Symmetry: C3
Subunit: 294 residues, 3 copies
């Protein structure tokens, strides 16, 4: 797009504040930012807040979200669709024009690990260019296994195609399939979807810990066979709802937009790859590392 | 096929009558009918009863089905395979020759939302050309959530390829992925698998209702990530068995031939898209609309 | 590979002995063997023990496995990754050089139907060329339905691509998708992944039996929609863990590397096809037969 030529908007921080016991304000941007998705390969991504996937949003079950989107794109409208909320798509997930803002209000009444994304037509084009992310809604009474959990991270899987190529987006195989991590607490890694960053800079843990991962496969098009090498998932909660509780899985299937909470123990020191077991995708980038030390 | 050139057999109504407390007679046709699958695009479909997917069949758990197939195809044999039944495939799912009829008897002893299809070799060719559909077997004691349900519809997802092109059917991407609705009660929409009809003529509901959808992804080749925009599924029953009960899903993965009962609430007026969240497929047609009014 | 030109190493028998109440010794080979994957088509497979998929390994829950890999490949290193075990991938799933052996020890503490495979970079290349298989870990207290089960078999699904073609492995469709059976008890069929052997030589059962299948889809790349024609699965245990118990499924979705225990009844004599219901794959070979006699 001619108007995006030489646009590179620096990342803006997620703005969030709680205004009531069950009411939260969140403010995000839609903006155009260059992301290195593979070594030497830039993608002029369509983003929320200059990150792809977008920044992590965490709320509590029963929170009402008062959402503001500032659209910094100089030419293309953008919108926001949270999978966590009950809303009217045609009133509450509407387009916000270039240089304008819109504020929408809706409740998050179910716990889980929900995808979020732009809902502007054509939706495939806006998702594939980078407008996705995850919102975690914490359960009111936790998970049954919370007391066993030593450590937590958030991982997202996504695909990259030929830049802004609608024929590729529809008919082509992915050029890259990648993981990213988003921070739950200051100090945790917060990265973009690329082929290399979680290889070079592994996630960390200690020998003997039980690790919880909140995972979502945002696609846009592929399913995921998610698996951690050298362990078995003790517990899995489909979509992060406590009630959907499976045990002893080797591999967790995730639909496009699907999430889960998975928990597992690392019994010995060394480096544990994290993959999607559809190994064409793992070869195209979707291998993250977990380094476990004494 | 030369013998199908200029064949367009008008749709015939499903014939069904109950002959006992647990015995039902059903009579269908195999026939060749032109279907508009996309605007300006005709597909000379291989069908049951001139519909693709085929007509909706609804029976009760424990019913024995006495099935008759009249094969109206002037050259190609056809057969019927119900996923709901216990049968001998090589005696009970046999081919019925052109201009002949066959009658088969078998019981439906499990509740659910089962795929049905032609079982003639090569099976891919007969399915891809349009010979699929759904049979619902109602549970003897219902679902736990029946009292909460205000309204019900049936949705099927299918793919269309290059007409009668075995290389495309095997190796190609779908040209179209579509939804159709089938009627539970006179007055409900009953449509074919096309890109447009549920966009132009949405399904209807009222603000505040709990909606049940009986869904099956007949393929033939793809999986589905089924999701309703602006809501979360309160309850899901995998394959429509009451015992396979998940809660709070954002998205339901369906294998090829897979079904589910899903239930959700619409809290605000407007138009709610219904998609498969593998968004290449949604772009190729698989977006249905639900219009919710005061 | 020049050094594999005219290499055809004859199959070696799996070597297994129990050395303690909870300790087992297993010895396998990595070796290069010609497999007829389709009629008239040889694939110079990278194998464990001259079989593709590899030989069946069966242990008990809580067993510690003392594993030896003899690498008979004259040029390429190989390794072993068992999904059943808790291990350090970078110490315990390491490469064993040509003409050398390595011995590793790790526990199998969870019951199920686990994939196993070579873990040598690039992992896709080693899996796609044939280095996969299944290890069953029997539950300490069985499955709830053991008393109902009359008969058992093991089935694996895999893909074959263009020989040793990394571009095909990453970007291409499978050339073949196949089933194989592995023997639980001497006398049961033990076959390789090909298009024909379970068509010509069906699995056997008697009218009225409840049949248990232990299934795993090793991929490397595709998911499976597993379905037996003419029946409905009475019970399914995801990944073969007793706790993940679904009922009345028509079709079981399996991620890449995913497994399940499924059980079903055959009520009438004749031939029951076993398929993946993604029918492009079934057309490319993945149809097995079950013959049911009086
Ligand atoms: Cu309160
Ligand atoms: Cu406010
Ligand atoms: Cu957008
Ligand atoms: Cu969505
Ligand atoms: Cu701990
Ligand atoms: Cu593993
Ligand atoms: Cu009765
Ligand atoms: Cu009768
Ligand atoms: Cu047919
Ligand atoms: Cu079928
Ligand atoms: Cu109501
Ligand atoms: Cu949504
Ligand atoms: Cu003991
Ligand atoms: Cu030993
Ligand atoms: Cu190897
Ligand atoms: Cu693996
Ligand atoms: Cu029996
Ligand atoms: Cu069937
Ligand atoms: Cu699945
Ligand atoms: Na591995
Ligand atoms: Na949406
Ligand atoms: Na069938």
């Amino acid at each position: 797009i001619a108007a995006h030529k030489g646009v590179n908007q620096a990342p803006v921080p997620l703005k969030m504040e709680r205004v009531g016991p069950h009411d939260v304000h969140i403010e995000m941007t839609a903006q155009i930012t260059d992301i290195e998705i593979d070594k030497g390969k830039i993608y002029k991504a369509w983003t929320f807040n200059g990150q792809a996937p977008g920044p992590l949003v965490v709320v509590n079950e029963g929170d009402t979200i008062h959402f503001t989107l500032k659209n910094m794109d100089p030419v293309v409208p953008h919108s926001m669709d949270f999978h966590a909320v009950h809303a009217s798509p045609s009133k509450d997930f509407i387009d916000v024009m270039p240089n304008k803002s819109g504020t929408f209000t809706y409740p998050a009444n179910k716990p889980g690990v929900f995808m979020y994304h732009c809902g502007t037509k054509p939706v495939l084009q806006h998702i594939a260019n980078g407008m996705h992310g995850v919102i975690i809604v914490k359960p009111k009474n936790g998970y049954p296994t919370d007391k066993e959990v030593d450590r937590e991270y958030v991982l997202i899987q996504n695909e990259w195609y030929k830049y802004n190529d609608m024929n590729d987006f529809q008919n082509g195989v992915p050029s890259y399939v990648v993981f990213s991590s988003k921070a739950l607490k200051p100090g945790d890694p917060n990265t973009n979807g690329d082929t290399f960053t979680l290889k070079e800079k592994p996630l960390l843990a200690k020998v003997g810990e039980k690790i919880r991962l909140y995972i979502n496969n945002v696609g846009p098009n592929e399913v995921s066979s998610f698996h951690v090498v050298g362990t078995v998932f003790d517990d899995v909660y489909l979509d992060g709802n406590p009630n959907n509780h499976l045990q002893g899985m080797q591999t967790v299937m995730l639909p496009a937009s699907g999430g889960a909470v998975v928990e597992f123990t690392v019994t010995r020191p060394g480096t544990y790859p994290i993959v999607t077991h559809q190994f064409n995708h793992a070869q195209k980038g979707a291998v993250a590392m977990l380094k476990v030390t004494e």
